[PDB]
Symmetry: C3
Subunit: 138 residues, 3 copies
């Protein structure tokens, strides 16, 4: 088939747009809000999916941030590594390889984001990578 639109919504009503192709047992899904572009012949701008403190579950354990989501598709994806920027409350920031999965809990999709220790509380995580998950359904 051709690519169908969809979205997830966060606790704070942020909308995470994606396109997907469902060929069961295969579901391939890309997030489309942050597709970077060359804005002129020599400059590449990255774009961020920006997730705030209030998008995550509390308490956070083991550098694992859980984003409960509503709507969208319901998959147990593999883990994909991403470029993260972790913004601390003191506006200090750390660039990291993050690891992202989609999982299902209580019939709800959740995005699992795992990263490294940071010296402070997190205000914001920015995903600077274009994320695509290839998933096996059943």
């Amino acid at each position: 088939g051709r690519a169908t639109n969809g979205q997830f919504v966060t606790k704070t009503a942020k909308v995470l747009r994606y396109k997907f192709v469902r060929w069961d047992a295969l579901l391939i899904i890309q997030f489309i809000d942050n597709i970077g572009v060359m804005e002129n012949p020599t400059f590449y701008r990255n774009k961020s999916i920006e997730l705030r403190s209030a998008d995550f579950l509390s308490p956070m354990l083991n550098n694992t941030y859980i984003v409960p989501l509503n709507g969208g598709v319901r998959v147990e994806s593999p883990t994909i590594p991403v470029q993260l920027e972790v913004i601390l409350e003191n506006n200090s920031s750390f660039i990291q390889v993050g690891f992202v999965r989609l999982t299902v809990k209580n019939g709800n999709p959740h995005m699992i984001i795992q990263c490294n220790p940071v010296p402070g509380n997190i205000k914001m995580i920015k995903i600077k990578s274009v994320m695509l998950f290839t998933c096996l359904i059943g």
Copy 2:
């Protein structure tokens, strides 16, 4: 098609279970032993594929650990990055981005795991990521 079960077996008779879809020229394969879950509404448990010293070939060179495998499918996959925990003989442990491929040697599948230097001998490598390889056959 829908997802078919399979497994690889290690030198020490550890069984590495996967599901795959074969649409030649495409083979997509996920390892399924360590699919993490949210065990309650706020906690995500990672699971490990645990590979011991005796699962690897000797001598090890250039932080490259080779796991000879029996059975399963026979692919030259791309490289996927993973979350590793490298357990040293002194039970010290290091969290790392590893890079994994499947390759074929002497008609046998081998899993290639590459990581960073550690200050000691390795007792165990745990893969904490859900691994899926998309492969091109011929």
Copy 3:
């Protein structure tokens, strides 16, 4: 379908060979120049895609190296993480997780390679990973 050959060419006339499968809306493309092999029963050799200074655009900003390409397919891929070795002018070298995308600018394909700061000017970037992109067309 089965896997079709193709290539991209760099500013300096380096040829980057790939195989792909196009099932629109899906395009899956692997680079094939650097498929590593076990050369004997205990040794795995990585192979590099070697990109020189003159393959990149100037000026470089924010550890982002842009490789303008000619020919090949024209995709907005997701980001894939890779093993990089960054060779400096003083022949010092740094092993890094890089992040690679294919993007389109002025109807031309460009490879976007992003990595970490290095203490010097870059002479060469080697991609030691086998790269495969799964892409969504339209």
